[PDB]
Amino acid sequence: PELTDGFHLVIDALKLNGIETIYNVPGIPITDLGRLAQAEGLRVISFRHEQNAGNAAAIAGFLTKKPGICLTVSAPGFLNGLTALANATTNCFPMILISGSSEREIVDLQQGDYGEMDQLAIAKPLCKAAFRVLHAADIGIGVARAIRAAVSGRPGGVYLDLPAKLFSQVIDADLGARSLVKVIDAAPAQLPAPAAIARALDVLKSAERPLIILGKGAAYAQADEAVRALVEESGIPYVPMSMAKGLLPDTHPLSAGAARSTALKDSDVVLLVGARLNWLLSHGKGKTWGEPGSKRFIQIDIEPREMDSNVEIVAPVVGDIGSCVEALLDGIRKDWKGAPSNWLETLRGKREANIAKMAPKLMKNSSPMCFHSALGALRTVIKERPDAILVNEGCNTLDLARGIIDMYQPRKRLDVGTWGVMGIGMGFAVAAAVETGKPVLAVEGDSAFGFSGMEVETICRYELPVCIVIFNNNGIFRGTDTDPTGRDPGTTVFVKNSRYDKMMEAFGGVGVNVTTPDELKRAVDEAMNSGKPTLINAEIDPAAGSEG
Amino acid sequence: PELTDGFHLVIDALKLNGIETIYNVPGIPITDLGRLAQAEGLRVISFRHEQNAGNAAAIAGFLTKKPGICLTVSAPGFLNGLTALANATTNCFPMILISGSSEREIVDLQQGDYGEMDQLAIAKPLCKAAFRVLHAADIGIGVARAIRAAVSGRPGGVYLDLPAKLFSQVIDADLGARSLVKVIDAAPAQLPAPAAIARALDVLKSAERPLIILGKGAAYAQADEAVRALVEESGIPYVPMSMAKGLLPDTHPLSAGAARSTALKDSDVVLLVGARLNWLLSHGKGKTWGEPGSKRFIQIDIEPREMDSNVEIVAPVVGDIGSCVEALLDGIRKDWKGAPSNWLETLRGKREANIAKMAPKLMKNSSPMCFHSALGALRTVIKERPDAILVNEGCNTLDLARGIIDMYQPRKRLDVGTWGVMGIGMGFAVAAAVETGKPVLAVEGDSAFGFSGMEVETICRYELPVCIVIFNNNGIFRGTDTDPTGRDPGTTVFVKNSRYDKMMEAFGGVGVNVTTPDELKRAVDEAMNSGKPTLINAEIDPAAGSEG
Amino acid sequence: PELTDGFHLVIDALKLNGIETIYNVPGIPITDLGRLAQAEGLRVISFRHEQNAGNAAAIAGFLTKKPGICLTVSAPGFLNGLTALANATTNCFPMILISGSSEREIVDLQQGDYGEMDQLAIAKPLCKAAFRVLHAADIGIGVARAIRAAVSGRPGGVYLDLPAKLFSQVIDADLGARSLVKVIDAAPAQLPAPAAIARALDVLKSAERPLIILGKGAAYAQADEAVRALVEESGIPYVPMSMAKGLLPDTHPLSAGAARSTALKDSDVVLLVGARLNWLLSHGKGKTWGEPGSKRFIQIDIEPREMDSNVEIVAPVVGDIGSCVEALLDGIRKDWKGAPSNWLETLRGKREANIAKMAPKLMKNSSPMCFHSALGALRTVIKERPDAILVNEGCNTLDLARGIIDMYQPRKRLDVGTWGVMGIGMGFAVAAAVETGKPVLAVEGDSAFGFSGMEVETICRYELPVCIVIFNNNGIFRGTDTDPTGRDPGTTVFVKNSRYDKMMEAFGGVGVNVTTPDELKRAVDEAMNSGKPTLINAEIDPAAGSEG
Ligand SMILES: Nc1ncnc2c1ncn2[C@@H]1O[C@H](COP(=O)(O)OP(=O)(O)O)[C@@H](O)[C@H]1O
Ligand SMILES: Nc1ncnc2c1ncn2[C@@H]1O[C@H](COP(=O)(O)OP(=O)(O)O)[C@@H](O)[C@H]1O
Ligand SMILES: Nc1ncnc2c1ncn2[C@@H]1O[C@H](COP(=O)(O)OP(=O)(O)O)[C@@H](O)[C@H]1O
Ligand SMILES: Cc1ncc(C[n+]2csc(CCOP(=O)(O)OP(=O)(O)O)c2C)c(N)n1
Ligand SMILES: Cc1ncc(C[n+]2csc(CCOP(=O)(O)OP(=O)(O)O)c2C)c(N)n1
Ligand SMILES: Cc1ncc(C[n+]2csc(CCOP(=O)(O)OP(=O)(O)O)c2C)c(N)n1
Ligand SMILES: [Mg+2]
Ligand SMILES: [Mg+2]
Ligand SMILES: [Mg+2]
C-alpha cells in the first residue's frame, strides 16, 4: 500500500505540533530534509553559520512560548548550534536543536566516520535534555519528548539527534501516521499552594518599602494583563530587568527603573517575578541591597530549585507566573491596605532627578557624536514606533541604550541575556522579523556586530524589515587603545573609520553613513517606513564611553 | 622585595617556552592579559569571533610544531573557542585554548555568576586534555603541562583554565621566576623496535604492487628529506592525502595521485605514513580497496591505538614519523630488490590518461566562468609562486582545487581537514600570514566564506598579505535551487550576484570583481605581488559543479 | 569573639533542617565530622561498604520524604556511594551524598592528590544535582540547595562535595549562625490546572472498563487517605505496582492485582498514579496492553517531561499526587455515575480463578522445601504483622514473594526497584529499622545477599530488629548448573549448603537453619517477637523456580 519515510515523518510531526519555521544551515545529511520541509509549507531560513541559526531559534522560543527549531549538520555544524543551544538553556528560552548524525556503529567504535561525534553524549552537559531517534516509528514520540522538555518546567534548549539512516527508513504510511503524537498541554499550568500565597501576602503587607522586580521570565510568561494588574492594584513600585522592559510602559508612574539603585538599597520586601538573584542583581549580597539582614524576598518561579540558590527566601512561591500572580492578585483584591506613599514619593523624586541629569546629554549635539546624543534619536524612534522590536548588544552601546531607550510594549527588547553574549544580534534580528512581522531596529556595537556580521546577507536574502544601526567607535569599549611597541594596532581597536554600510551594499541592502543625530533619525525613519534591509554606519566618538 | 602577579607569570611562562603569538578576542577577564603581552613583545592578533581565533591557533600549531595559543573570555567566548579546539583535536593539531573563568565558589554552587560555567568540566569531553590553575605559584607548571599535552604523543588541543582571581594574586618576584618551567623535550622522539621494522620490511619486499600513502601526519612531522628519500630510493609509488600535497612535489614521477582509484584498488601492500584509515580512505573497506582480503597494511603512527582501528594491520610501527621512516629507510638501503616495473608503468598509464582528460576542461572558455577554467589559472599561480600558502575550503571549490592545483613545497595547503569543517578559511589565512611570512592565496566557496568572512576586517587591520578569491556561484554546491512554493529563496542559494569585494572595501582592503580566467590571473598576480589585502569576487556558473 | 568552624556549620545546617540520622563509612577527611555529628545528638550509622550506606540513605528518603544522608570519603568511597546515589535517582528517592574531597588546586591540575578526583564533575552525569562548597559562609546555602534539589520536583539523589579545606575554616560564630538556612516549603505542593482535571474526568467518565494503576510514586507521596478514597469512591478496580502494595490492603475487594493480565489487556482507560510506563509496564506496548489503539491513558505525575515518554497520554495531569488525587476526588464527589459493574465482576472472577491455581503450591510440602511453600509461611507472618517492614530481593525469591505475600499497610515493601539492583537488602534493612523503629523481615536470595551480606555485622552492632531469611537454593536462579569440563563449579552456583546462619552468629546474632515451612514459621515468629538480630538459613530445592 502507501509508504512513508523518516524524512516525511519528521516534517509531519513538526507541522502537527504547530511548528511553522525552521532555521538551519544545509549540508550532509540534512539537505533534503530542509528541502522537503520547504515543499511541505514550512518556512526555511538558511544562515551563514549554525550559531546564528541557533540564536534565531532561541529568541523565537522567547517570543512565541513554542520551541524554536534549529536544524544542523553532523559534528562541526552541531557544535556551532550547541553553543547557541547552551545559551538558550542559560536564558530559559525554549528551543530544539535538530542535528544530523553519522553512522552509529562507526562512531561507537570511533573509527573516524564523516562528521563523527557522539552528539548525544556531547550535548547533554550543555543543554536541558537530549534524545536520539533510531527507528522511524519512534519519530513521533521523539519529537513529542523534545517539545515537552523544551517548554515545560523551566524552559530550555533540547537536542534531538537524527542519524542519517533514520531518514531513509520506510514504513507503512497508515502506521506512521498513527505513530505521530500531537502534544497535549506541552507547557502545563502549575498552581501554587494557598499556604504559600498566604505566606507571601503576609510578608508583602508588612512592608514599609516594598518593591516588585519583573524579570524576563515574567515577560516570557505572557500574562501581561495579570502582571500589570498586580503592579497597579497593589500600588507597589517595580523595577524591570532588561528584557522585561515594556511589559509595563517604562514611563509608568510606578516604574522605579530610573531609580534602580535606591529601590534596591532601601527596600525591605522584594517580590521577584521570574527574575533570578544572579550577577545581574548582585546575588542579593553587597551594598546594592543595603545592610545585611535588611531584605526579605518573595519569589515566583516555576523551578523550585531556584529558591535559596543565593540567599534566604522567606516566601517561595512555585508555579507558573500566570497562575501565581493571579493568586496573589486575588488575595490583594480581597484585602490590601496600600503601598506606603512615602516609598512612592522617595522613588518618584529620585527618578525625576536622574532623568533631569540625563536630559542635557541627549540634546548635546557635538562632533563627533557621543553615545547619548545618538541614543536620544533612537529613543524617539521607539517612542514613535512602540510596536517595533529592538535588538541590542554591545557594552556602551548596550548599557546606555538600556537606560535611555524606553520600551512601551512587552517582549520588544532582545539583548545579550544571562551569559552576556556578543553575537546574538543578527540571529535575533532575523527571528524577530520572521516570527512577528514587526519592524526590527538592531542597535549594535561595532565589536558586537562582528561576531555575527555575515548574516546581513541572510537578512537581505529574505527581504526582512531590519534596520541595523552600528555605533562605530572603532573598537571594544573605546577606540583609543594603542600598541606600546608601535608595531600593531591596539588589542581592542578595529580598522579606523570602517564603513559597514558598504558591507551591506555588497548584498543588495541599503547602506547609509551618518555623523549627527538628525542624520541618524532621518535614516532610521526612511528604513523603518520602507521595510527594506538597511545598515546605518553611525560614527561615534572613539573617546566617549567607558572601559567596562 | 619586588613583587609580581599572575598577569606577568602567565606571559613570562609563555615567553620562556617560545610562544611568540597570541590569537584572541579581548574582554572580561582577559583584556589586560592581552595588553601586557603586547607590552612584553608578543604579537596579539584580535579577531571578530573566537572560533576563527582558535582555527588560527590550530593551523599555527600544524605549521610550527609548537602549540598555538588562543586566549578567550569566559563561557560564551570559551564555547566559541572550544569548537575550534575540538577540531584541532580531530586533526592532531597542537593547540592550547586559554580562557578566563569566573569565581570558583559561585560556579561550584551554580549561583549564576558572570559567564558562569565549569569550563574545565565542559572542556574535557571535547579536547585532548584540560587543566585549571588556582594558585599563582603553579602557573609555570600549569603552562608546562599544557604544552607537553599539546605537542607530545598524538598532538591535539588543550584547555587551560585561568580563574580571574589568579591574575590578581601577588607573590614574590624571585619566587615566581623560579616557578616557571622551560619544557625539556616537549615532543620527544619515539623510536620503533627493530623487530617491528623487520616485520614491515618483510611485508614490503613481498609486495608485487606496493603503495605508499602520505598523510598530513607525515607533513606535520617535518621529516621532509627522510620521507622523500623513503619514496625515491624504494621506487614505490605514493598517493598524497589532501594536506600532504607538496611534501613531495605533486608532479613527482612516482606520484600516483592522478591514478588514485587504481592505486588503491589494485595494490597489495599499502604503507600508511601518518594517515588514518577513516572516511577519507573509506575505512579500508569496500570497492575502493579492491576485493576483501587483498590488502596488507603497514602503518606508521605515533598513536599505538590507531592500529586495528578499522581493519587488521599486519605490520604496525609505533613511533614518531621521523624515527620510523629513517629506520625503515636503513632496512631498504641494506636489502631491497626495487619496485616491480610493470606496476609503476601501469600507474603511469592511468595517470597520463586522467591528466589528458582534465586538460580540455582547464582551457575551455565559457560565460559564465566554470570551476575548471578558473582553477586552471590558479594552478598556474601556485606553480609560479611555489612557496606561497594555499587556504582552500568549500565543496566544488574544495574538491576540484585539490585535484587541479598542484603543490610543490610541504605544508603549503590548508583545507577543511578531518571533520570537513566550513569556517576555517579566514582563521587559517590569518595564522598562515602571521606565522610564516609567506603570501596567502585563500580560495573560498561563497558558502564556506560566509562562516568566517567577517574576519576580512582582521586581515585588513594587520595588513596581512592575503589574497582571497571567492568562487561566487550564488550558493551551496549550486545556485539554481528554488522554493517550490515560490515564497522564499531556495534553501541552498544566496543573494544572486553578491559583490563580496564591496565588503572588503568596507575595511580599506582591495576589492576586485572578475569574470574570466584571464582576469582572475591578473588580479591574483597584482594582489600577491603588491602584498596588499585583497578580496577577488569571481563569478562562477551557477549551474556548474556537482549537486552533492 | 566566639568562633565557629566548618565542621560545626555543616552539622548545625543539617540539624536545623530536621536531619537526625547519618549513614556513613568513616575515613579521611570526614572521620571527625561523623564524630561531631554523634556528639551533637545525630545518630551516626557506620557501614562496611559505602554502597550499602548509600542504599540505606536512599530508602530512608522514600520512607520519610526527607533526604537520606550518606557521608562518604574521597574518590574511592565517593564512587561507592555514587553508585547508590545513581540508583536513588533512578527510583526517585530523596538522598544527599556528602563526600569529602581533596585539595582543589592539586586536583584541578591532576597532579596525583590523595583521592584525587573532580567529584563534582564525575557525579553530575549520574545524579539529579551536584554542588560544591568552597567557603564556610556558603555551607548554609549549600545545604539548602542540596535539600531543595533532593525532595522538590521529581525527588532524586543529590551530591554535595565538601573539600577538606572547608571543614577547618574558622569564621565568627554569630556570622555563621546567621548564614544558615532553614528551608521553607522544601517540597512545595504543585496543584494541577482545572482544565487538566476536567479533561481527565471526562476521559474517566467515558470508560467502559476503567483501571487505576498505583505506582510507588503514589506510595511515596503519603496521600494515603486521598488515594484510598479515590479508589473506593470511584469503584474503579486498581492494580498496585511492587512498592505500592499495601497502600490499600492487597486483599481489598477492588484490587485486580491477582487478575493483572486481564486488567491490563482488556481495559480501555488507565489512570496512572505515580507509575511510569517503562519495562515494568511493558512500555505501554505489545499484547500486554491488548490491541494497538485500545488504550487511553490518564497520568498523574510531578514530572511534566514524563508524559508521552513511551506512548501518547491523552490526559496528562501534572502536579504532586496529593493535590491531583484530591482534585480528581473532588469532581467525582460532585458528579460520577459509578464504575461499570460488568468490569468488576469480570475481574473478580479472574482474581478468584487465578488465586485457585496458586493455592495448591503454597501448601505443597515436599522435601526439599520449594519456593511457594516457604513463602506461604512468610505470607502468614506479614498478615499477622502488618506494621513490619518487608525487604525483598533476588529473582525467584523476588518474583514469587511479590505475588504470594500480601501487604496491608503503605510503604512496608522495599525491593530491588526500577533498576532491579541486587545489594539493596542489607542497606535497606538497616535504614528501615532505624527510620521506622518497626520489625524488619528481609526475604533474600543467596545470590542477592552476597552483594551486601557483610552488613549483617552492622545489623548486629546496632542491635536492630531485623530478621533475615536466606532462600538458599545454592545459586543464581537455580543451583543445578555445572561445568561441562568438570574442573570448576558452575558459573551460577555457590558453595553447597552455605551456612549463612553460622555467619550471622560470628557477630553475636542468632542463627537458625530450617528445612520445612513450619520450621521457618516458628523461627521467624521467635526472631520477630524478640527483636534480636537473626538470620534464618532456609534450605530451598535447588531445582525449583525458573532461570533467565
Ligand atoms: N512560565 C514561567 N513561569 C514561571 N517562572 C518562569 C517561567 N518562565 C521562566 N521562568 C523563570 O524566570 C526566571 C528568569 O530568570 P532571569 O532569566 O535571570 O530573568 P532576568 O535575567 O530578566 O532577571 C528563571 O528562573 C525561570 O525559571
Ligand atoms: N609527529 C607524528 N609522528 C607520527 N605520527 C603522527 C605525528 N603527528 C601526527 N601523527 C599521526 O598522523 C595521523 C593523521 O591522521 P589524518 O589526520 O587522518 O591524516 P590525513 O587526514 O591526511 O590522512 C594521526 O593518526 C596522528 O596520530
Ligand atoms: N510527590 C509526587 N507527586 C507526583 N508524582 C510523583 C511524586 N513522587 C514521585 N512521583 C512520580 O512517581 C513516578 C514513579 O514511577 P515508578 O518509579 O516507575 O513507580 P513504580 O516503579 O511503582 O512504577 C515517577 O514518574 C515520579 O515522577
Ligand atoms: C562571545 C563573547 N565574546 C567576548 C565577550 C566580551 N565582551 C563583552 S562586551 C564586548 C564588546 C563591547 O564592545 P562594542 O560591541 O564595540 O560596544 P561599545 O562598548 O564599544 O559601545 C565584548 C567583546 C562577550 N561578552 N561575549
Ligand atoms: C560547519 C559546517 N556546516 C555545514 C557543512 C555542510 N557543507 C558541506 S560543504 C558546504 C559548503 C559548500 O558550498 P560552497 O562553500 O559555496 O562551495 P561550492 O560547492 O558552491 O563551490 C557545506 C555548508 C559543513 N561541512 N560544515
Ligand atoms: C548488581 C546486580 N548484579 C547482577 C544482577 C543480575 N541478577 C539478576 S537476579 C540475580 C540473582 C538471582 O539469584 P538469587 O539472588 O539467589 O535468587 P533466586 O532466584 O535463586 O531465588 C542476579 C545476579 C543484578 N540484577 N544486579
Ligand atoms: Mg565599539
Ligand atoms: Mg558556492
Ligand atoms: Mg538463589
Residue numbers in the entry:
A (entry chain A), B (entry chain B), C (entry chain F): 21 to 568
From the study:
Thus, after screening ∼3600 clones in six rounds, we obtained the final variant MeOXC4 carrying four substitutions E135G, A415C, Y497F, and S568G. To rationalize the effect of the different substitutions on catalysis, we solved the crystal structure of MeOXC4 to a resolution of 2.4 Å, modeled its flexible C-terminus beyond E567 and compared it to MeOXC WT and OfOXC. Structural analysis showed that C415 is in close proximity to S568 of the flexible C-terminal loop reaching the active site, suggesting that this substitution is important to (re-)organize the active site for the new substrate. Substitution S568G lies within the flexible C-terminal loop, adjacent to A415C, and likely provides space to accommodate the bulkier side chain of C415. The third substitution E135G caused the greatest structural change by creating an extra cavity at the active site. Thus, the E135G substitution does not serve in substrate accommodation but likely allows optimal positioning of Y134 during catalysis, which is supported by the fact that kcat increased approximately fourfold by the E135G substitution, while the apparent KM value for formyl-CoA slightly increased. Three-ordered water molecules (W1–3) are observed in a structure with a trapped α-carbanion/enamine intermediate, with W2 (in close contact to W1 and W3) proposed to protonate the Cα of the intermediate.28 W1 is hydrogen-bonded to residues corresponding to Y134 and E135, while Y497 and S568 form hydrogen bonds to W3.28 In MeOXC4, this hydrogen bonding network to W1 and W3 is lost due to the E135G, Y497F, and S568G substitutions. This change in the water network likely helps to promote GCS activity at the expense of the OXC reaction. In summary, our structural analysis showed that the active site of MeOXC4 is reorganized for improved substrate accommodation and increased catalytic activity.
